[PDB]
């Protein structure tokens, strides 16, 4: 089954006519599908953008095109007066957002890459939790059986851009023997949480 | 907007400098594919996608032509203002904790990119390095700027220091971000 796409609506001019210096005129079109609880809740928002100014949008919860700034009314009026265009776009939630979610369900939403977890001294203990997907993760430090509440700092979740994430979680401790410090990592890919212990 | 998942089917970009365009699909903030608009081909970003999924690259070419038209129309009815140059924000980090002698990947994140015209290169001990370099497409942000990530596969180190070098019109001079 092929993937589908959201169509950028054509502006109605003009002719017109058409468009060296470091300047740039930028146009964006973003066809956005928002899913919650499988596909029990789906919302489509298409966004038309000049430089950084979103000037018109179609939101499936509204059901007509809407001008967002004073650059938009001519576009939104024109799109909403074209019965076939507006019908096309009202149907896109089904014909595109839901269509393509079925393909995600077979690939992307099955992707479960387990984290590599290591503990290293520091430059203080750093639990590095690397190369995982998807994003949901919980990393905790423990001293013997007690969750450390305190002296723990974490990076935000770091997106690597290659369909993996990492996170680093650091512990400040005053060691006395024979304390065992352990890093505990929970992730949806794991059959059991990963527990790594530090020595001495 | 609060959702379990968000997809961009797709992220369409056209600009007058070049001119150039970009077409890509994203899912929860990562890029599924881009379409190479001059070669007319879909380039998937994971093996699994390459094996099981299919996108007609003519779709992208159809759309981008529409953005080029739309850009003319908006310029026609407005005072035709060019993009403002943002100051991009640069971070360099590794894919995993670096040990000398063990292969790794430096990652350079260039964020708050607007307009989406940038150069990102790597330097080793001050000289240009092109083996092991690759980069993402421009990745969308919900303020309608972009980010982009460059990767350098390498064998650390003993005595090798790395810089990510970024050129953008929002900067006065090239910005060199030194790695840890």
């Amino acid at each position, epitope marked *: 089954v092929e993937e589908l*796409y959201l*169509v950028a609506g054509e502006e109605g001019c003009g002719g017109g006519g*058409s468009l060296g210096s470091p300047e740039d005129f930028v146009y964006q079109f973003k066809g956005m599908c928002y899913f919650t609880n499988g596909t029990e809740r789906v919302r489509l928002v298409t966004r038309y953008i000049y430089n950084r100014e979103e000037y018109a949008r179609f939101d499936s919860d509204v059901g007509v095109y809407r001008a967002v700034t004073p650059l938009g009314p001519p576009a939104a009026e024109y799109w909403n007066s074209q019965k*076939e265009v507006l019908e*096309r776009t009202r149907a896109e939630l089904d014909t595109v957002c839901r269509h393509n979610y079925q393909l995600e369900l077979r690939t992307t939403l099955q992707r479960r890459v387990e984290p590599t977890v290591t503990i290293s001294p520091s430059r203080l203990l750093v639990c590095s939790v690397t190369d995982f997907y998807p994003a949901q993760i919980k990393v905790r430090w423990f001293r013997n059986d007690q969750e450390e509440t305190t002296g723990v700092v974490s990076t935000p979740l770091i997106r690597n851009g290659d369909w993996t994430f990492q996170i680093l979680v650091m512990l400040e401790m005053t060691p006395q023997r024979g304390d065992v410090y352990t890093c505990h990592v929970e992730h949806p890919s794991l059959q059991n949480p990963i527990i790594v212990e530090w020595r001495a | 907007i609060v959702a379990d998942h968000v997809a961009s089917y797709g992220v369409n970009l056209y600009q007058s400098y070049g001119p150039s365009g970009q077409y890509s699909h994203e899912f929860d903030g990562d890029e599924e594919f881009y379409v190479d608009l001059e070669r007319k081909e879909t380039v998937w970003q994971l093996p699994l996608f390459r094996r099981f999924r299919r996108f007609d690259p003519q779709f992208a070419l*159809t759309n981008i032509a529409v953005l080029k038209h739309n850009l003319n129309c908006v310029i026609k009815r407005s005072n035709s203002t060019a993009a403002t140059n943002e100051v991009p924000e640069v971070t360099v980090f590794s894919k995993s904790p670096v040990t000398l002698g063990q292969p790794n990947t430096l990652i350079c994140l260039v964020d708050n990119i607007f307009p989406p015209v940038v150069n990102i290169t790597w330097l080793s001990n001050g000289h240009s390095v092109t083996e092991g370099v690759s980069e993402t497409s421009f990745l969308s942000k919900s303020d309608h700027s972009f980010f982009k990530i460059s990767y350098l596969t390498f064998l650390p180190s003993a005595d090798e220091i790395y810089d990510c070098k970024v050129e953008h019109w929002g900067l006065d001079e090239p910005l060199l971000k030194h790695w840890e």
Partner: T-cell receptor
């Protein structure tokens, strides 16, 4: 409706021919199709804003253009007997496409 | 393919298609003229009707049917089904081979 001219053409092998199409007003996509009993309806090319936007599988001696007002011409050079067909122009604004009446070309020996 | 029926009977035509689609549309042609659109159905619909026509769409078998009620001599024509092949815009449609319908007096 869309209008096409000329309606009827006779040519010999090796000549060239030009067909014109005026789309419905406010339609920016203009496409051309070739209809033949042997092969049915075959897509030649589509123009949008002056430029060719999609192309079918005909060789480069079939070519086209589009003017600022959206009107289109197509051209067939080094004509062959097999080029004899109904040439249809169509215009679109949305999903439905509106066809002209067609140009009938007979290439004779 | 070909269909022959009497004025006043119903005519049913069928086509199939090969790719993912957003919409399907049936067209009619008389000899030496343009195709004329009849009725459009989107891939999220099973049935749609208009005037004397009804189109059905089965997205799993990838087929469509066109029903013409109380057929007249004027319905004599070739009928073609065209899909968007997922483009959902522009002037390129993929047309099937067609059914010739003859309505007899």
């Amino acid at each position: 409706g869309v209008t096409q001219t000329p309606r009827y053409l006779i040519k010999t092998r090796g000549q060239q021919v030009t067909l014109s199409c005026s789309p419905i007003s406010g339609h920016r996509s203009v496409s051309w199709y070739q209809q033949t009993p042997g092969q049915g309806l075959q897509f030649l090319f589509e123009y949008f804003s002056e430029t060719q936007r999609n192309k079918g599988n005909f060789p480069g001696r079939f070519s086209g253009r589009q003017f600022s007002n959206s009107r289109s011409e197509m051209n067939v050079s080094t004509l062959e007997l097999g080029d004899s067909a109904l040439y249809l122009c169509a215009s679109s604004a949305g999903n439905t496409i509106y066809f002209g009446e067609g140009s009938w070309l007979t290439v004779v020996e | 393919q070909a269909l022959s029926i009497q004025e006043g009977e119903n005519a049913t035509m069928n086509c199939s298609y090969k790719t993912s689609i957003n919409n399907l549309q049936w067209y009619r042609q008389n000899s030496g003229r343009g195709l004329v659109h009849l009725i459009l159905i989107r891939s999220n619909e099973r049935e749609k009707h208009s005037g004397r026509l009804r189109v059905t769409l089965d997205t799993s078998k990838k087929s469509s049917s066109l029903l013409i009620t109380a057929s007249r001599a004027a319905d004599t024509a070739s009928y073609f089904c065209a899909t968007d092949a997922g483009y959902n815009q522009g002037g390129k449609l993929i047309f099937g081979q067609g059914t010739e319908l003859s309505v007899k007096p």
